[PDB]
Amino acid sequence: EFNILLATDSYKVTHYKQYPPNTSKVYSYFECREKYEETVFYGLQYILNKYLKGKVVTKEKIQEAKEVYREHFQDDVFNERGWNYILEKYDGHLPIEVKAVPEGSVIPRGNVLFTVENTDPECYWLTNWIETILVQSWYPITVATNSREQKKILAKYLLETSGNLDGLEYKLHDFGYRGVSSQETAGIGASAHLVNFKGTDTVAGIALIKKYYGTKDPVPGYSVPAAEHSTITAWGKDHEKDAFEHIVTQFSSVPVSVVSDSYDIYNACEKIWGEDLRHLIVSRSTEAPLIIRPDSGNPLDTVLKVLDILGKKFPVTENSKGYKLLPPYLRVIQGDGVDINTLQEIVEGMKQKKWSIENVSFGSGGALLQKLTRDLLNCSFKCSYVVTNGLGVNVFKDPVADPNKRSKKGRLSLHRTPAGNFVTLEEGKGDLEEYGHDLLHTVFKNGKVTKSYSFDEVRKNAQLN
């Protein structure tokens, strides 16, 4: 089982002896320090429920921690007393209060997103002990944010080239399951992407959403049948056509994606799909199109040549915006080399060549769920206020060599400005009541989740515009 006493950075075990004597309170906060100008706050609710709520302290876990740390530090520095107190006083429930903005909220950089403080003067050391666990929320936040920023690009070009945003939620598919660092990461990352889109091949995200957020529909994400290199190459190089025919025939009534670059993407599109099996394609339903899938070469150049080829072998129409459109039974999915940067290049390149963004959907894996760091949005957790000797003290850091690492001072609160923007008031100035109500809500207190959100609410909060 998971032991919260063992889920922190090793040195935090020695911190209770480092605070000023008679410190009864430690107050800390998380922010995405000051392009990603606005961030999607999502993921905390998962961590609270899975790791922090309920009886997380037991006699066993304490003993286990005692032994582990004794060897790790080659000494007994573990705060056994402190934990026994929580076990005995609160029945293993954590005496801390957490306030946060609603899950899914879109908040500009440099603002307080959530705060942590102890509710018992005895557990002044508990606030920062759980920094490590709570800080990992940077990941679902960063994934959701990066995913949302790509949706903006897609939304912009789709609107421009088609006149509407139909199907936008299916324009960027999650292909990152094998590309992430672990199973737990796959679930968290995939759920973050689902906040903005509906297409995913990382099934793990579904279960996480159901269990920790919940949705009205029986499922938050969908997928379609699709081939991979093994199912095509297995037929032997001279039988790629046989493979294609067999696959589109097995999935004749549902959308089907078929990777076509095993040997020569251009020959596959022009001769096999465009000639040898054209009759099996033009006969398909608009609800069950063939989705050709290139998977190599320069992303933009490949997509353009593919479209040029298909346009020469299939009927092409021009929509009301003046952009070329493949027939309804035929589409393309670019699932290689796609990241927020190249995505922009591809749709822009398509527009210049007069191809509607309607013709192509995208897939992204590692770049979507793995090539992300806590530094992209500068997620940071810092102590800004303590009470020692019964007196409040506003604390902060301000490294001389880096003004960007400066932190906020005192008790904080988030407010809406008259012009509809946001501001984080420091030093308790929020009490002045000049900016309406603080936007953070208590979501956790003394072992209980006091406020939560359904995934439908999160999605609503994260919408664009």
Place this chain on the structure above:
Amino acid sequence: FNILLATDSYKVTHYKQYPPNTSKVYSYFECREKYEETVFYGLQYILNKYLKGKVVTKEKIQEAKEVYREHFQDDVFNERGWNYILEKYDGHLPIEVKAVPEGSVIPRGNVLFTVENTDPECYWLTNWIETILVQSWYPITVATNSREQKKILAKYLLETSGNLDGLEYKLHDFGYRGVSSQETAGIGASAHLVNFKGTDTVAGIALIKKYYGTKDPVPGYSVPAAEHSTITAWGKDHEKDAFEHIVTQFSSVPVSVVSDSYDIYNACEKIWGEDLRHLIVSRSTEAPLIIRPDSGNPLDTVLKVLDILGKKFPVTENSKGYKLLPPYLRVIQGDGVDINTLQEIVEGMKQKKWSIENVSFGSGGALLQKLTRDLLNCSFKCSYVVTNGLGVNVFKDPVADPNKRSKKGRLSLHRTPAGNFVTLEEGKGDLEEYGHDLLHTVFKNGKVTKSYSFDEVRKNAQLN
């Protein structure tokens, strides 16, 4: 955990795409052709935690059936196939996995492990588990990147001190908060511990002892250390009090004290260097003060810090001619360190004549998070199938990218006469023109057939 729900969605639809009359699907994993050799580590963890024993149950099958029915809006799930495995093998997977020993250091472009079904009815199972097995790229990459950094550290420590004492402690893992999840933290931390012994991510410890085991009393260690909150809590005008309180609380053990809260240079020169100097020069070699800068240009900061300390404390020159701080005073750079800057820092220290003995490093996100599967081009591909009872050598070869070509047929790994490695394709390993295949069966029909202790892994991964 349900293995029937631990694969890329589309693989659920593959059993109907393979050529009819296919009785076998054989696939392999490689770190396709800096980073010329990789450390094979991690597969054993995945086999034990996710693939061994009864992994199929009536419940798990029904659960997947319903999930996929809604996910696909159609019942494409292969309930019959999974049910077959449940009744025939009591939920044990009919697959065989062969691999090089855990910890092996292998050149790029070589087969590292292979997978194949052992029951003709389960030809589709081989690639069903590709997703879960492919995630081994992570520990492989962490271990590899960490080992390359140890090489750099080794080169400069030896060059500037004459030996390699304490090498396994020169790079500390600070990545707990910087990774994407709890599970990732444990996996990555254990990968790092293959090369070093210092870590702040305790989860790595539990993973090691449970999945590999060690006859070791100290697989991973750590020392008392302050953070910004414990220093800044005292108030800006009391940083000195915080420092004095901390060093006295940990008077007899090594202690790391972050010193850049306000002005790292003032702390080194005035506080540690003057006001509290009496509390430092009195410490023992086994309980040094470890000053930790945490901001600014990593190389420039370290050099200015050493220059400052050199002026306030007695400096010696070792037998190699490099300057050395007193035994009770050291430095740890735990910000902005990665494989590239690490190299710039030690080279910069060497030019200014400072022994690498003076400084140790810490790395978080760059160590366990800023890494991807394409760093070593980790890939899983099918190279052989049996259809209509005839073997067929399989492979891909995209016209737009020769780097994506895969190997053909049955593979085997052998040592060459000159002591190198070669991957023999198309079953040629059978000719016996080389020695024994270096891959070993580590998994077969639900059972882990060969295991390695973390001590063997460390041995296999050693340097030089």
